[PDB]
DNA sequence: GATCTGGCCTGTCTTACACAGTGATGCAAATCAAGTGTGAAGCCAGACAAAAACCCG
């Protein structure tokens, strides 16, 4: 009810229960059973309102499996060679 | 007896059998560290007007 960095996982849960309600219903009725992409783009927009295309591109990269992730074939290459 | 020949003995000669990987130095290239005011690529403005993909008489 006060802040969120100190509010725990379920404290935040009870804080935005109704946020979750609306977002899940709208998502799984509009995108035909999906919440990942809609919450993804929601956070992208709500952070890009502060024109932080650096973090936007970084998050789109981690969603695209390229950057600070080392896809398992790469780590396997390193362990072998 | 005298010699022939065949067997064994070395004796050379042929191909082959394990070196790139270690930690160190040492130069060349990159960057980067400030200065300070720029413009440029998007941001987003609620609301409005020309195209691709597919429904529809």
Residue A46, CB, strand B, below 7 Å? no
Backbone angles phi, psi at A52, to 5 degrees: -115, 50
Give dist(CA A23, CA A17) in Å, integer.
10
**Token match 């952070």: residue?**
A47
Residue with structure tokens 């009870």? Answer: A14
Q: Give the integer Cα–Cα distance in Å for A24 and A79.
A: 42
Rounded-to-10 torsion of CA A31, A29, A4, A41: 20
A36 CB closer than 7 A to any strand B atom: no
* Resolution of the structure, angstroms: 3.3
Contacts of A57 (CB under 8 A, 6+ apart): none
């Amino acid at each position: 009810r006060q802040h969120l960095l100190s509010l725990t996982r379920r404290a935040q849960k009870h804080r935005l229960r109704e946020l979750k309600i609306q977002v899940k219903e709208f998502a799984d009725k509009e995108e035909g059973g999906d919440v990942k992409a809609v919450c993804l783009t929601l956070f992208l927009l709500a952070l890009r309102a502060r024109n932080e295309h650096r973090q936007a591109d970084e998050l789109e990269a981690i969603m695209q499996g390229r950057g600070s992730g080392l896809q398992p074939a790469v780590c396997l290459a390193i362990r072998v060679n």
